[PDB]
Each structure stands twice: as C-alpha cells, then as structure tokens.
Symmetry: D2
Subunit: 260 residues, 4 copies
C-alpha cells in the first residue's frame, strides 16, 4: 500500500481515535499534510507525533464559527484541501431511554456537522477535484439491542454518502463510505485491561476472521478510496468488518443441530 | 382486505395527506376508531366525515407538551391505543443548500418526533400488544438529485424501524415500515392540473406498472402490517412502489442498443 | 384475512410441505381452486382433504413433458390459471462438499424449473392478469455454515423475481417473493420429537418474536401478494421471518459486556 | 497502487477480456506470476507479451478434466497458487426466451465452474492462505429488461461469495466480490465503432462520473482485495461502478418538474 499523495492536504474529523490516528499515519506516509479537527485534547499529542506534517485544531464541529476558523487556519498553515475524512461521532446512545434532546445532539454531531464541514471545504474539494470518505458501520445495516442513536445516525450517513456522491459528481468530487466492524478501541482497551488476545476471542463470535480489526486495516480502505486508484468508485460502501455483515443471528456456528 | 379490528384504537400522524386519508378509511372500514394527528387543518374535515369514530387533534409533534395533550385527548374520547402509524413528515429539503437549522428541523419532524410519539403511546401498545408502522420511501434506498433531508430522514427511519422492532419484541409489539413510490398526492394534483392520466404518463418511466400508486394501494399494505395476519412480520420493510426499487438508471427501456 | 378469490384457479408447486398446505388452505378458504404440483406422494392426501376444491398432479418439474401434461390436466379439470406460487425446492446441500452434478441438479429444481412452470402457464397468467409469488429465504440474505446450494439458489430466486417483474409488467402480471425464517417443519417436527415448545425456545435466539413461524403466518403473506390488495406491489421481497433478518451475529443479546 | 506480490502466483479465469487483461497487468506489475485460464484464444497473445511471468492455458472450465489439467500445468510452470480471480462468464442470455438448456449452460459457466476451479485450487490457497475475488455486477442488484441469465447468475455469485467467505475463513482464505458497472469492453468497442467519447456520452446517463469505467479502474479494486492491505476484508462486495448503483429509474436528472 504505497500510495503517493505528495503535497496534498487532508482533513480528518475525529482524528483522536485509534482509527483516526491510523488514518492520519496512512496519509502522512503517503506524503500528505493532515489537519486533525476534534473536540478531544489528545489530538494535540497525535499531531505533535508527526511534527510539521500534521496540525491539530481543536474544533467543536457543531459550531459554524469554529468550522470557519478551522478552515481559515488550514489555509494559513497548510493550504488548499484535497481530502476530507468524516470520522467524527458521538457515542451518546441509550436506546429508547435517550431523550429528544439527546437525539438532536447526536444527529447534529454525527450527521449534520458532516454537511457543514463539507460545505466549508467544498470550494477546495471542487478546485482540487478531491474525494470524501464518510464512516458508516456494521450498525448501519443491523439492529443492536439498546443502541438507537448511533445505528440510526450511521444508517443516515450511508444515505448521505449516496446523495453527496450524486450532487458532487458534477464537480469531480468522489464520495464514499467505510463500514468497519469491531475495531480495537481505546474503550475496549480499558474495559479489557489492555488484553488483546481475550478481546479477540470475544470478537471471534462475530467476525469470520476471528478477531477485532486493526485500525491500520481500516485506514488502508480509507486511503484506497481517497486515492486515484479508486477513480471509478463513488457512492459506494466499502466493508472492512472481517465478515461481520455476511452473518445473521446464527453467527458462524451450526444452528440446525440444536433442534435435536 | 376484510380485516376485523372492531373496538381497536389507532393513531395516524400526518393524517391530512392523501395517504393518511386512505389509511384512516381503511382502518374505519375495518371497525377501528382512529385519532388523526396532524399540523394541517385539513385533517379536521377528514375526521368529521366519519362522525364519532374518527377524531382530529391538531398537533405539533415537535412539542412534547402537545404530544402529552394529544394522548390525553385520545384517552378521553377513544381509549387505549392499539395501532400507531407514523406518517408525519416534512418536505423541507434543498439538498446541499439546506442549512444546519433546516437539517435539524427536518430530522426533528421526520425522525425524532416518531420516537417521542411512540414513547408517549408505549404503555398503551405494550398493554394492547399492538403494532407500529413507520414510513420509509423509495428515496431511502436511492439518491435523487437535489434532495438530501427527506431521503436521509427516511433512510434513518428504516434503521429506527429495525431497532424499534428488536427492543419492542419483548413486549409483544411489532414494528414494520412501508416504502411507497410515486403515489397520487395533493402536490402532484396541483402541478398536474388535476390531470391523473398525464401524471400517470410521466410516472410510467419509473414504475413497472406504468402509473402512480393509489393512496388506497399504500393503505392496504399498512392495514395488513397492523393486522394479526402479519403476526410473524416485525422489523421488515414492505415495498408498495409498483416496481420502482427493482430498477436502476437504465429504467425499464433497453440501454445497450444506444451504444450503436 | 377474508380475501375473495371465487372462481380463480391457483397452482402451487411443492404443495406437500407444511407451508404448501397452509398456502393451499388459504387459497381454498378464499374460494379458489388449487392444483398441487409436487414430486412427493403425500400431496395426494392433502388434495383429498379439500375434495373437489383441490387436485393433485404428481409432477417432476425438471421434466418439460411432465409440466405440459400437468397444465393440460389443470385445463381439463379446473381451467385457466390466475395464480402461481413457486414453492418447490430441494434441500440437496452439502456446502463445499456438494459436487458439480449436485449443483446443477439443485439449480435445475430450485431455479430453472420455476422459469419453465411460469412459461407453461404464461398465456394463462397473461389472459387472467394474474400474480406470481416466488420463495426466497433468510438464507438468501445471509451466509450459513455448511449450506451453499440452497442459499445461492434462493439468492438467485430473489433476482429472478425482479427480472420477471420487469419483463412481465407489460402483460399486467405481478411477481413478488416471500422470505420466511425458521418455520415449523416436517423435518423439525421429527428431529424435535414433535416437541414444539422446545423447538420454539431454540429458535428464540434467531427470531425477535421468540419462536418458529407458523405455516399459516407465511401463507397470509402469500395470499396478500396474490390478491388485488397488493395491486401496486411487484418485484418486492416481503419478509415473514419474525425479525430474523434485522439481526447480525450478535443476535438479540448484548455483546459489549462480554468484553469486560 | 504499488503493492508487492513478488513470487506469488495468481490465476485469472476469463483473462482474455479487457478486464482480465487489466487484472493480469496489475498483478504482473505487482511482481506476481499469472496463469490465464480462458476458452478464448486471444489469451495466448496476452500471456506472450509478459514472456515467462504469465502463462496461458486454454481451458473449458465446465470440464472437470480440463481443470485438473490446468492446475497440473500451473504446478509445472509456476507453482503453488496464492490468488484466484474468478472472472470467467458467458453472456448467453435471452431473458424469458432462454431455454432450460440455456439456463443450465449459463449457470454451469458463470457459477458452478467457479466452485470447481476453487475446489481444485483449494489446497494451494489453504497452504498459501490466499484470497479469492469473484465478480458480481450492477446487474446482480437491479433488473434489466430482456436479461435474466447473467443478472441471476451474478446475483448467485454474490451469495456464493458470502458462503465461501464463511466456510473458508477457518483456513485463512479471504473471499470478496467486485461489482463493476459499464466498463469499456471489446463488445462496446465494436458497436461503438471504436469511438470512446461517443460510448462515454451514452453511459453518462447511468454513471455519476459521466463515462464508462476503464478496465484498469476495475483491476485496481481487484488488486486491493487480493493484497494484504485488505486483510480484514472478507465476504464483501466492492462496487467500482462510477455511481451506477446509487441511482434508480430517475437517473441523475430531476424528475418532479416533468409532472408540470
């Protein structure tokens, strides 16, 4: 995976997550400069890890003014943007117990802000004829007990990816989505006791490949779709879930024998 | 389609539309008492045609107080609710031009309000072990130039229908969705000059059956899902689109010959 | 579910199964005459159960001559056909171990014969402007360990339903598919020891409604799609799986807590 | 797209097509040795252009003996196989007019032969822990007037890809599918008069990116899935259709204004 994006500028919302950092590292390795937009303060340490190749701009993407200031800062230090990876999300989700206020807050963060960040960067993507990668999930294709806000948000991102692709094609902009499964996480690393081999064995029941996915494995699909190798890929959903989405409630274990 | 729902009470949000009116008539014909919830005043005339079996309650479903008051009125005049048909929607939609405020307004009406209305009626549906029918569209499965808010909202309804089905199954409540195509509407009647055969001639290009759908044809599918005949149907999306969703950009005309 | 199909003639392939008999009973109750085409000899006892309302014709649907003779017999005793329910299938399936010969045999029975039976009856369905119901499964939407031939066959039936719908619409024929989950079976009844409550509890892990589906519940969806109430439904897949297809490998039980 | 597959051996059925040729070049450029299997003699000229790195073996994949002989020749000249790209297909397709014999012939070539070729190479892929790429189409997700056999065959390939992924995962083999749209082909070049801009002008109505896809653009997606960058991708369908599959019968043009 030795893609060349020398001189290009990329924007990565929600870059403080393990997936985010892997996407940032993948872009830097390809020669691109990256601007990390996030509300989490740990993004600053990630940006400093790459020195002048990556910049961190703490941004509340629900604030239109914060987005305009972030794009102004990107223009001042880095330049015109070619790639946008919308990875920002909230895990505010209590299913039926979540309130109307929680719903609108989660939708604003997970969905509406993706439109505003794309709009603030549109003239850049139009001039650069760039590409956009949004993030769906296996939760956008299936129901999970007790989780409403994030699955519905991700199912909405999936449709937004298609409508953006259609209405952005005239300007030469490609828009796709990436659908990962269970990926090694900061939250999983803490609840597991930083025990990967046990967390992998728990995940084996839901992934044909028998483990959690690595952030790097997700980042590879993001870079491919951003690169010109995917020059005829737009509006598509690229699954990187180790086979999660090919299975149903029976999993990968036989079910008929239980009847006897 | 001679189902018996005598004595059962149904609630139909967005009942002032042609679809709503057909669903109301279908339920009344089946012996049910109906409460019409809508922000449009044309619902008042619809309820009066059925005398004491149908009630109209002008309701802004984005107002929690309005929902509580609407359920209180249903309790006083009709009683415990068995069926909820979530048909309320807004067509506030300017594609990419729609603002952040427009996004949240459309999501509040189309999606979040469905949750609050379901929550206010949940104890009724649980005691009656009723069924819920949400409304998706052909727009939830495909992209349409210049239309973002309504397609994305309906794509979100599809996932909400699945998560509602899962978390409501334990209480014996079935939740499904209906996906219609181009159906004869008030808006089509005005742009058409109340010319149905002319509007049918345009829609033939997008429906295998060569016309717009009738509101009654949609209501038939709604009534089936509400009835006990659909007793093993939950979490499903039932298409009533005259073949719209089996086609792609080529339509129903050959395309290869055009290359010669 | 009190549909009126008085005087109409229906054809039910594979009518010897429990689903088949329920579909036959549903049609008779609606006033239709039914011809059961099947290779199983137990269909004769089913036909005699309805006396002159149902006729049995032992037919090897892989034999073109057998199909022509069956349609000739239907014309002699019953008349012009209005409804065709393609329920015939084989469970010849050993996954990767199944041979090329097994593959072509299963595809011929499950898929190709559906085309020939439809072709032999086409002029009837064209004159009567009838409807066709094919049978998919939850296995057409998901992978099941050790089962290749039947899932692939059913996934192919799903596409065939769409292509038939498109190319049959000009003649006023509607074509749809029905996708059931685990339904109480002859095979399940024997391996379970005719113990339904235990078989239901095993199936609860894969169906939101917590049991196997009843053949009658599947038959209701078949009759609806055949009837004129579904007059704007063509090319659609109507799920009657109790919520099986909304779930993934996590089922309906929490999965995050296992990580701790 | 600078992947290193030095020393690895790949097999490409149906390698005489433009897609096949692009996939062969992509693999050779990545350092792999390639065996071209095809019934078309034009594959012989393709292999000779790469000298000793690419081999051509004229093979009727419906003949079990031909497959065993083809694997024997691969073993003698190149060695153990790591990658299998199932691209062989037939366009024998007359829609409803196709006969039972035509159906089984098309299914044998398009679908069943993929199983036999995979079975003959399985021990290689298991020892090498390789990956398999099957070919679906935009025709597997939508109906096209007058075309049954190829759309249904490809819809069956999609499910086979999922069941292969599940039952091959235990052995470390990844299986995915690629779904292209209208791609520049030999057949299009002949009806087009070898006029690409004219063929592009027709395809713009069905692809958001306004042209036919290049064979290389499809090959890029095939190469990614074969490579270790897709190490958490199994059982997925990767669309490379220029936005074809996000559209419905309305295409990318507004349709509501037509009603006025």
């Amino acid at each position: 995976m030795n893609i060349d994006l020398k001189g290009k500028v990329a924007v990565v919302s929600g870059g403080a997550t393990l997936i985010g950092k892997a996407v940032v590292q993948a872009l830097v390795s390809a020669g691109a400069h990256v601007a990390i937009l996030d509300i989490d303060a740990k993004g600053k340490a990630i940006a400093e890890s790459f020195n002048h190749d990556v910049m961190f701009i703490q941004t509340d993407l629900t604030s239109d003014a914060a987005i305009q200031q972030a794009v102004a800062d990107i223009h001042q230090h880095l330049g015109e943007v070619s790639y946008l990876v919308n990875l920002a999300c909230t895990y505010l989700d209590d299913g039926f117990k979540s309130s109307r206020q929680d719903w609108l807050q989660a939708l604003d963060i997970n969905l509406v802000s993706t439109v505003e960040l794309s709009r603030a960067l549109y003239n850049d993507l139009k001039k650069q004829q760039g590409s956009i990668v949004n993030f769906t999930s296996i939760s956008a294709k299936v129901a999970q007990t007790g989780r409403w806000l994030y699955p519905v948000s991700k199912a909405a991102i999936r449709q937004l990816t298609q409508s953006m692709a259609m209405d952005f094609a005239a300007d030469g902009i490609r828009v796709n989505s990436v659908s990962p499964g269970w990926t090694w996480s900061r939250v999983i690393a803490e609840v597991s006791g930083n025990n990967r081999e046990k967390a992998d064995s728990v995940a084996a029941d839901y992934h044909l490949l028998g483990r959690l996915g690595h952030p790097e494995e997700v980042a590879n699909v993001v870079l491919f779709l951003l690169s010109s190798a995917a020059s005829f890929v737009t509006g598509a959903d690229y699954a990187v879930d180790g086979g999660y989405s090919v299975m149903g409630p029976e999993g990968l274990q036989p079910a008929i024998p239980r009847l006897a």
